[PDB]
Amino acid sequence: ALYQLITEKLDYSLKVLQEKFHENNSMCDELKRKENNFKNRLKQLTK
């Protein structure tokens, strides 16, 4: 009983954590694009 339920809990937790990792990667690259856009906006503004 300790075995099967805990192993299924962990198998579901793997998906739970991988979802948040993928979404964190998406938020990270969107942050990268945002900061690049702000820096290029500054570039054009100075020009």
Partner: peptide
């Protein structure tokens, strides 16, 4: 996965702080 998730969260916090600083 938890370790790298925490790392990404910290980096995202830094990036958001920088964006707010320039914003």
């Amino acid at each position: 996965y938890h370790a790298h998730n925490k790392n990404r969260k910290q980096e995202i916090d830094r990036y958001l702080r920088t964006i707010s600083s320039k914003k």
